[PDB]
Design a binder for these strands. Structure first.
Ligand SMILES: [K+]
Ligand SMILES: [K+]
Ligand SMILES: [K+]
Ligand SMILES: [Mg+2]
Ligand SMILES: [Mg+2]
Ligand SMILES: [Mg+2]
Ligand SMILES: [Mg+2]
Ligand SMILES: [Mg+2]
Ligand SMILES: [Mg+2]
Ligand SMILES: [Mg+2]
Ligand SMILES: [Mg+2]
Ligand SMILES: [Mg+2]
Ligand SMILES: [Zn+2]
Lengths: 56, 51, 196, 67
RNA sequence: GAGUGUGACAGUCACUUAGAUGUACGCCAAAAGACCGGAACAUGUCCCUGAGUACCGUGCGUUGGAUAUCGUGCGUGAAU
RNA sequence: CAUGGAGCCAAUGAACCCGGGAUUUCCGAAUGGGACCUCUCCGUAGUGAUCAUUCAUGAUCGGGAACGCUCCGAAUUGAAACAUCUCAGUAGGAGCGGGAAAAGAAAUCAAUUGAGAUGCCGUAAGUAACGGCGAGUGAAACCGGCACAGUUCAAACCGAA
């Protein structure tokens, strides 16, 4: 069975749900974490310095 | 017949009622300057990122 | 001489293995090992040390004994490219001293309080013990106290976490003035961490 | 002018304010039911002014500690 | 006579401008009152003045810091 | 936004602006419990966790463009290779935290005899110093300015004053 279009017919599920906290469809249904805002992992909002460039 | 909870169906309902044309009177009022909006879609396309 | 009894406590703890404090140490370390990470105690073990460090027998002043492991920065060997100078980590102790680690763990256990100071109270082959003095800035007794009501200011919150205690300033290279403090005062971060 | 002003609401009694609030709720029910059939209202601004009068009555009640 | 608007280029059409006015809550704030109190000297087999601290040994990091940077891991460890 | 129809409001002073209030669904620090369920379960109607106090009460939590402090910490790159070095305490990480933060009243700097808290700027100076003494890295004091500010404990003596 080809790794291309044939295996893409099994895409009848999800790995990420809608996030309560931020509204992004980034809540991992297995790890119970939002990969966008960090909901379900931290009480704070997920932010990294590498999300932008070094400001210089 | 997928099974939605109350909130998932509410978000689907909002997506459905957003998929309407701009009213004709709005087009008249704006002098043909507002004739569309970015939430138009078709059900058989790239699906909703809602549910 | 007419010396206060605090002087006698100080003398007993000057060379503890040569005084009665050695037997107290043998009996106390069993109890202290039985305890956890951060233990509150009614009175300081060394009253003179606590009093010279700012302890007072009043409401809003808390003394806690903290347990910290020995040795340096328990470090993982990198699993990617390093240049043989950054590959080795076994001999790399940290830049954070054990006393300041104890102070910060005490601060973590007591979110509403501020660390005042701490002192050494014991150690064995696996642990060191420090007693940390903490102040309640929102207690009216502390608010009235004019020798302590500075701790109610907005810049005094998170003292131990920003290196503002005596141990923290020792760790920042600001325990002395003059030569050797070119890259330490007014802050480590102010000179690109080249001091320390 | 409007259905009833702030001075009118403050002049009434507690029972009078409650009665007028109930009547305004009834009028809003009737007007919204008429629009349920799709048909245009007989008075398009009447619905909005009824709603704002209801809000004004509720605010006067809350100020007067009735609700 | 900064400028912008006004059916084409505006000191004098409009808003402005220059210059004066006013302003609730606030903020600073001088006179004048209430309060703990301050500063010198003489005398000295008198008392007190911060400890696992300062220092040192050894390892490592860091530093321009070089046998002479700072840190901190282990060990050792005072004086009054 | 956004002069279309039809109405509504406004001289009982609206619109608008300034100040002060009210309302303020659910999720969210989210905090009665549970969330592939932004809802759901018990309803005893909800002080979730960690703490201070006499146990009336109180504190902390999340957010904020950058700045600030503490700690952890690469490699590309340069050296025309490369390992010390450099890149660089950079990038990135963790914690704390305010309108600023940190520092701060010498167990200092000087030099033959002086000055007199700290910070920031100028200069010293690419100097001293380090360095396959290669490439490179790299001060401080003195001095001139901005702004100026000094103090509180522990102890001796008294002993709840
Ligand atoms: K013109
Ligand atoms: K090259
Ligand atoms: K190469
Ligand atoms: Mg593949
Ligand atoms: Mg940056
Ligand atoms: Mg812990
Ligand atoms: Mg400060
Ligand atoms: Mg003019
Ligand atoms: Mg915060
Ligand atoms: Mg090269
Ligand atoms: Mg200080
Ligand atoms: Mg460097
Ligand atoms: Zn999210």
């Amino acid at each position: 069975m080809s790794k291309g279009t044939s295996s893409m017919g099994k895409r009848q599920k999800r790995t990420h749900a809608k996030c309560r906290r931020c509204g992004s469809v980034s809540f991992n249904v297995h790890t119970k974490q939002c990969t966008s805002c960090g909901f379900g992992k931290t009480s704070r909002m997920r932010t990294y310095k590498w999300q932008a460039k070094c400001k210089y | 017949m997928s099974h939605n909870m109350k909130g998932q169906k509410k978000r689907l309902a909002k997506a459905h009622k957003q998929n309407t044309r701009v009213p004709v009177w709005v087009i008249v009022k704006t002098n043909r300057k507002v004739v569309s909006h970015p939430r138009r879609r078709h059900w058989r396309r790239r699906s909703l990122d809602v549910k | 001489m007419v010396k206060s009894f605090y002087g006698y406590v100080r003398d007993a703890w000057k060379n503890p293995d040569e005084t009665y404090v050695n037997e107290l140490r043998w009996e106390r370390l069993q109890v202290w090992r039985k305890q956890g990470s951060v233990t509150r105690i009614e009175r300081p073990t060394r009253i003179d040390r606590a009093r010279s460090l700012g302890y007072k027998a009043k409401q809003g002043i808390v003394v806690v004994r903290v347990n910290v492991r020995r040795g340096g920065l328990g470090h993982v060997r990198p699993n990617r490219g390093r240049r043989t100078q950054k590959m080795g980590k076994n001999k790399v102790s940290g830049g954070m001293s054990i006393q300041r680690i104890a102070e910060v763990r005490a601060d973590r256990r007591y979110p509403n309080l501020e660390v005042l100071n701490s002192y050494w109270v014991g150690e064995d082959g696996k642990h060191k013990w420090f007693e940390v003095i903490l102040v309640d800035p929102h207690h009216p007794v502390i608010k009235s106290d004019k020798n302590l009501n500075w701790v109610c200011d907005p810049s005094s919150r998170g003292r131990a976490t920003r290196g503002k205690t005596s141990a923290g300033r020792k760790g920042r290279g600001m325990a002395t003035r003059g030569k050797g403090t070119e890259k330490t005062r007014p802050s480590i971060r102010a000179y690109k961490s080249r001091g320390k | 002018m409007a259905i009833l002003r702030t001075s009118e609401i403050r002049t009434m009694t507690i029972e009078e304010r409650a009665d007028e609030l109930e009547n305004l709720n009834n009028e809003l029910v009737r007007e919204r039911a008429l629009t349920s059939a799709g048909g245009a209202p007989e008075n398009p601004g009447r619905i909005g002014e009824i709603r704002r009068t209801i809000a004004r009555i509720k605010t006067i009640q809350h100020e007067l500690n009735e609700i």
